[PDB]
Design a protein around this nucleic acid. Structure first.
Ligand SMILES: [Mg+2]
Ligand SMILES: [Mg+2]
Ligand SMILES: [Mg+2]
Ligand SMILES: [Mg+2]
Ligand SMILES: [Mg+2]
Ligand SMILES: [Mg+2]
Ligand SMILES: [Mg+2]
Ligand SMILES: [Mg+2]
Ligand SMILES: [Mg+2]
Ligand SMILES: [Mg+2]
Ligand SMILES: [Mg+2]
Ligand SMILES: [Mg+2]
Ligand SMILES: [Mg+2]
Ligand SMILES: [Mg+2]
Ligand SMILES: [Mg+2]
Ligand SMILES: [Mg+2]
Lengths: 55, 56, 143, 63, 63, 145, 70, 56, 141, 206
RNA sequence: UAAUUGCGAUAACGAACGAGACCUUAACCUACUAAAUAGUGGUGCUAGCAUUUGCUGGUUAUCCACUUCUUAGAGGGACUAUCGGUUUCAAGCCGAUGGAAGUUUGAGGCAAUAACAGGUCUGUGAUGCCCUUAGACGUUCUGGGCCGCACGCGCGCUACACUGACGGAGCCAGCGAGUCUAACCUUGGCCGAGAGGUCUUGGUAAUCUUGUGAAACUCCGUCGUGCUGGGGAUAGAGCAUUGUAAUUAUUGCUCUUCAACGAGGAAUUCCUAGUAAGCGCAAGUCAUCAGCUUGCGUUGAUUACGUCCCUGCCCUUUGUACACACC
């Protein structure tokens, strides 16, 4: 985006970027530990998703 | 008196090729307001350095 | 020794395969050839008059041989050139969907290609058979 | 045409108002021991070879 | 051009100042010394300081 | 291809379709100089006429030549696409035409006069000697007429 | 559209007797002999190569080179 | 749900944008210092960092 | 399982990966032999490794390559590099050091960025011009 | 030359000349000596090459411009004038042709003819613009050996490029046609004219 | 020295903000941690050609092994190193060898004190004050206008062609983007000259579009210097698409029409290496509309490596009756 609100001035642009890191791990586990590992190890602003099975 | 052919045979007013006209640049730094605020009215708002001790 | 079309270089494969389909007469040339421009990106129709469908088909054959599966849309994009928009700047544009698709059918009925799974077209087991043939016959000119 | 071959001895300085000229002292490979400073045109390093189209003359300062 | 800042030269002075023992003319081992002997917030910075401590060291050996 | 000889049979500058045609230039492009025939049109018609494209205009035995006359003013009976022709659907009798030579000059004026006789804006525009295609006229189009 | 576009049997023999002494012969070279426009030139080359009289040392489009028979 | 991870994190950002805003126009009298959002299952936690919490 | 090595070479943004095993000496790139290539104006460029080192030395080894990314010219410089490096990678783990260093001597004496990967790379264009260094036109007034 | 054949074949003319001699497309880098003084150390010719295309960086240092092959330097200066910026493949092809055309005429080495043509069109001395105030005279200065080559090259190329405009004759023809005359100056070529006419003016102030 | 960057001189010594450090991105890892959403080798399954063992493919899981290529976490690396030239043998500078890298490594981001009556009340439910406030300067609906055309100025785009147009064909990138209460990116099969249409399908995405088979470029031909087949302005006629709406023609396609322009006066812009320039792509804008912009990769030169001559701007010295500071 151009820095200025108006049209005056040399044409200065500005490049803002946001950096998204995605990680996925594979696990084979029973009904307990999955449910035990998911409630905790939580973080304020890290997205955690648990997908199920093979399909 | 309509269509290209008419206007083509007409002379082009010389305000076509004119300049920027300026009109009040070199007068910029000179306030036309005639007003000019005053030292008291300044030190009321921003304080005067003579009273700084009683500020600190 | 054994031969694959990969041993034959690019152009001179297709020139020979062209003369092959030509020598044959089993083609299925649509008949709107010579009236068609082969892309919207072109000025003139091809100069070959009677011909050039052989060139494309033979070209089409070799490409699909080279890879897994190819469709019309991929041929449109491949064969497509750079159309001059006139006083406006150039842009790449796709070639004609009909010519290419009709090429795929003209060869399939003739049996150098078969409709593949997942999409597109696959080179027939007898396609490879008669492609490697004339491929090796090219090296017999240089022998 | 009395050809004259000269080997750049040392690189002196940039003369001329534009600065294209570079002062340099040279030596002839025919009868050395006489050194004369000449004015060049392009880029120059030490131990180069200049072709003088006349032997004896020189300039110094350029405007 | 490459000219060490004041903070490099200033650090380097004090370094040779309190450690002449150890501190040879080898940058590599001087570098390794720095991490043990000194606290610098960046890899880059440390090397620039070690390079110059080495450059000063090298010239102390003669005069 | 090959080295041709002939005799005296080749002629330069043969005239047809109320215009003149350079004989020693290739016949595909030779015909183009006629109004209403371009490169494409010439291309299709010559092929249709069972004529060798390698030939020049100075070549082409009279029958071949006159054949080409037919196909051009009668494209539809000779199997030409009908989208390949300049005047199609007409404005009146609805018939698709390929208008040629001196005759195409007229079919411009007819049209222009239609929009003029109707007093349509597009027509009004033309009569004023302006750019009718809805282009910006401020900066462009200075010399002109 | 100035000369050099047509056969002219006298031009044929014109080529035949004039090709010797050519160290360099090409498309542009054939036009410099006050004859042989470009189209007919590139045909002339192939037909001079039909039997002898020229040795292709070159390859392709935009450049043609032939030399006297030996 | 059914969103892109991309559009998510961006739109998530905007969420904190509108959130902090709403509180800043509200709790300024309480000395509101900004916020934080904790994403958990079963709950969404938002914590007010205002200096005077007796009025919040 | 036979003795084999894998290398790569990269020119500009191109990357050429090449497997060197012990063989009867086939030299192939992607699917086609080294005798094709084309660009072909540069054909002798990628032959060059086979030349400096002598047309033998490949008789006990098969060389296959594949090139993705880059461009028409850019790939050609990357393949030859993966070739020459792969030939000298084979004398690293297998043949001899003294022959290996007689190979890098035969290359680098002449070279053209052979075992050495070219470090150049497009500079980011910034605002104020259509190019990286190039600025726009200003007319003053 | 002890021919060697393995799985994927390498052709005869290929196998043979390559390992034997390091020469050009097919032309000998041996022989080909600079026939003038100076101008050596500024004309390359050993170390030999195959084609004129190279990824080397000559631009990072001043005089390493000279270490480049003088044949390549001739090609580089071909690809220019707008539309032809880039297009080394265009030029490098034309060069090989030009050599074939030069070789046809009066034999010898096309690569040596290149050398002769370059050494013969280099200005020995020239005139700059020294202000002196107001109306400015012209000081005669002798051109550096490095610039002397560079200048020759651009001269030849320009002169051929200008002759190759709006005429059936091709670039490789006009380039050769120039190099052929520039080898021993006939004053029939663009470069020989301009070089000498710079030296005529260089002698007209002195 | 790019730098109040330092060295040295020194009534100063030793300091801090700014420059530097720092941050990001592009370079280098057969060394660490790994991967069916990246990929190789081997084997089953499997096709073609050759047969003497071979050569060239298929097979989202038939298995086994691996991390060179891809990917990004953690580390390593450069500090102008080694040696040598030159200089108060001081900071530095230059050359050579080695090196992924030695131009502040290349490129950006950040960026002190201070100044302008610079621009922005037409971004803001940021705002003082003024004006207006029901026949409204609020707001909404209909149509028109911002595109209007004798002319002057500026940024561009396309050309004047044979280092070319054109027709076949070889065929090679990178930065992006993509649809939930939904119609976004679109493969594939048909229909159509094309534009496009139709039935379906993958994709909330390293998984599908997409290897974005992009363009310039390379090759084989047709054309032959003739405004020619260079060039495509202008215009007629028909078909499509976006959108409630296309007339003053949104764009797209086909035919025909076939302008000016044969290298451009005085002037003036931009640039020193993967740079210039040539080329196309993606993103913003976007229902439709790029000749624009912001990034990207492709091909890849000529010329400097200097000077203060022009211009511009800093720095002292000096004058001052200016200090609202030469408006
Ligand atoms: Mg293409
Ligand atoms: Mg094509
Ligand atoms: Mg016409
Ligand atoms: Mg790795
Ligand atoms: Mg080195
Ligand atoms: Mg103002
Ligand atoms: Mg505002
Ligand atoms: Mg407007
Ligand atoms: Mg083409
Ligand atoms: Mg139809
Ligand atoms: Mg014309
Ligand atoms: Mg055209
Ligand atoms: Mg010009
Ligand atoms: Mg867009
Ligand atoms: Mg805009
Ligand atoms: Mg004073």
């Amino acid at each position: 985006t151009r820095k200025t609100p108006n049209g005056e001035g040399s044409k200065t642009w500005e490049t803002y970027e946001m950096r998204i890191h995605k990680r996925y791990i594979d696990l084979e586990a029973p009904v307990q530990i999955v449910k035990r590992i998911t409630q905790i190890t939580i973080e304020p602003g890290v997205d955690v998703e648990v997908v199920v099975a093979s399909n | 008196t309509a269509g290209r052919r008419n206007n083509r045979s007409k002379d082009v007013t010389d305000s076509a090729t004119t300049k920027k006209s300026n009109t009040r640049r070199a007068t910029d730094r000179h306030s036309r307001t005639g007003k000019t605020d005053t030292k008291k009215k300044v030190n009321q708002g921003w304080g005067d350095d003579k009273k700084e001790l009683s500020a600190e | 020794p054994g031969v694959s079309v990969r041993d034959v270089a690019a152009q001179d494969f297709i020139n020979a395969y062209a003369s092959f389909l030509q020598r044959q007469g089993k083609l299925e040339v649509p008949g709107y050839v010579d009236i068609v421009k082969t892309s919207s990106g072109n000025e003139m129709p091809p100069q070959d008059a009677e011909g050039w469908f052989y060139k494309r088909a033979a070209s089409v054959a070799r490409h699909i041989y080279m890879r897994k599966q190819v469709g019309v849309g991929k041929l449109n994009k491949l064969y497509g050139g750079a159309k001059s928009r006139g006083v406006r700047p150039y842009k790449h544009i796709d070639a004609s969907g009909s010519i290419n698709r009709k090429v795929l059918q003209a060869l399939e009925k003739i049996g150098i290609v078969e409709i593949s799974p997942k999409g597109g077209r696959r080179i027939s087991e007898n396609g490879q058979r008669d492609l490697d043939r004339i491929a090796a016959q090219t090296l017999e000119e240089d022998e | 045409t009395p050809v004259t071959l000269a080997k750049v001895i040392k690189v002196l300085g940039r003369t001329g108002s534009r600065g294209g000229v570079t002062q340099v002292r040279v030596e002839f490979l025919e009868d050395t021991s006489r050194t004369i400073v000449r004015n060049v045109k392009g880029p120059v390093r030490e131990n180069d070879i200049l072709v003088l189209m006349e032997s004896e003359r020189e300039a110094r300062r350029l405007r | 051009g490459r000219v060490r800042t004041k903070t490099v030269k200033r650090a380097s002075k004090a370094l040779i100042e309190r450690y002449y023992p150890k501190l040879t003319l080898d940058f590599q081992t001087n570098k390794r010394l720095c991490d043990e002997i000194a606290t610098i917030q960046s890899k880059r910075l440390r090397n620039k300081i070690a390079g110059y401590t080495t450059h000063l060291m090298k010239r102390i050996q003669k005069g | 291809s090959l080295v041709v000889q002939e005799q005296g049979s080749f002629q330069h500058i043969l005239r047809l379709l109320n215009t003149n045609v350079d004989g020693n230039i290739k016949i595909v492009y030779a015909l183009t100089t006629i109004k209403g025939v371009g490169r494409r049109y010439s291309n299709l018609v010559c092929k249709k006429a069972d004529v060798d494209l390698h030939k020049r205009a100075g070549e082409l035995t009279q029958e071949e030549l006159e054949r080409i006359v037919q196909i051009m003013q009668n494209p539809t009976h000779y199997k030409i696409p009908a989208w390949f022709l300049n005047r199609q659907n007409d404005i009146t009798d609805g018939k698709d035409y390929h208008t040629l030579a001196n005759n195409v000059e007229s079919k411009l004026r007819d049209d222009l006069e239609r929009l003029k006789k109707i007093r349509a804006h597009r027509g009004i525009r033309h009569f004023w000697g302006l750019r009718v295609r809805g282009q910006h006229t401020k900066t462009t189009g200075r010399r002109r007429a | 559209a100035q000369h050099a576009v047509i056969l002219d049997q006298e031009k044929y023999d014109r080529i035949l007797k004039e090709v010797p002494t050519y160290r360099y012969v090409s498309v542009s070279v054939l036009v410099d002999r006050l004859k042989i426009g470009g189209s007919l030139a590139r045909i002339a080359l192939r037909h001079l190569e039909k039997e002898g009289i020229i040795k292709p040392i070159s390859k392709h489009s935009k450049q043609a080179i032939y030399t006297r028979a030996t | 749900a059914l969103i892109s991870k991309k559009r998510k994190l961006v739109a998530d950002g905007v969420f904190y944008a509108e959130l902090n805003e709403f509180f800043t126009r509200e709790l300024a009298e309480e000395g509101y210092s900004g916020v934080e959002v904790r994403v958990t299952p079963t709950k969404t936690e938002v914590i007010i960092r205002a200096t005077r919490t007796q009025d919040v | 399982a036979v003795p084999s090595v894998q290398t790569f070479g990269k020119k500009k943004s191109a990357t050429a990966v090449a497997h060197v095993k012990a063989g009867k000496g086939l030299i192939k790139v992607n699917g086609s032999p080294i005798t094709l290539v084309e660009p072909e104006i540069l054909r002798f460029k990628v032959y060059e490794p086979l030349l400096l080192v002598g047309l033998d030395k490949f008789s006990n080894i098969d060389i296959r390559v594949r090139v993705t990314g880059g461009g028409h010219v850019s790939q050609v410089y990357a393949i030859r590099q993966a070739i020459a490096k792969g030939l000298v990678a084979y004398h690293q783990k297998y043949v001899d050091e003294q022959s290996k260093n007689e190979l890098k001597k035969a290359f680098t004496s002449y070279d053209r960025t052979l075992l050495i990967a070219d470090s150049r790379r497009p500079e980011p264009k910034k605002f104020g011009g259509k190019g990286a260094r190039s600025r726009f036109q200003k007319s003053y007034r | 030359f002890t021919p060697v054949v393995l799985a994927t074949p390498i052709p005869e003319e290929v196998q043979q000349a390559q390992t034997e001699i390091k020469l050009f497309n097919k032309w000998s880098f041996e022989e080909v000596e600079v026939k003038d003084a100076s101008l050596v150390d500024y004309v390359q010719v050993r170390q030999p090459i195959f084609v004129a295309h190279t990824a080397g960086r000559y631009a990072n240092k001043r005089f390493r411009k000279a270490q480049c092959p003088i044949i390549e330097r001739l090609t580089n200066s071909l690809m220019m004038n707008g539309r032809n910026n880039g297009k080394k493949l265009k030029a490098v092809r034309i060069i090989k042709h030009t050599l074939d055309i030069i070789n046809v005429l009066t034999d010898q080495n096309p690569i040596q003819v290149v050398v002769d043509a370059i050494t013969n069109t280099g200005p020995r001395e020239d005139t700059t613009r020294v202000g002196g105030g107001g109306a400015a005279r012209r000081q005669a200065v002798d051109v550096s050996p490095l610039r002397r080559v560079n200048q020759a090259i651009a001269l030849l190329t320009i002169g051929a490029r200008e002759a190759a405009f709006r005429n059936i004759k091709t670039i490789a023809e006009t380039l050769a046609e120039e190099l052929i005359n520039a080898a021993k100056g006939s004053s029939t070529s663009y470069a020989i004219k301009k070089k000498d006419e710079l030296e005529r003016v260089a002698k007209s102030n002195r």
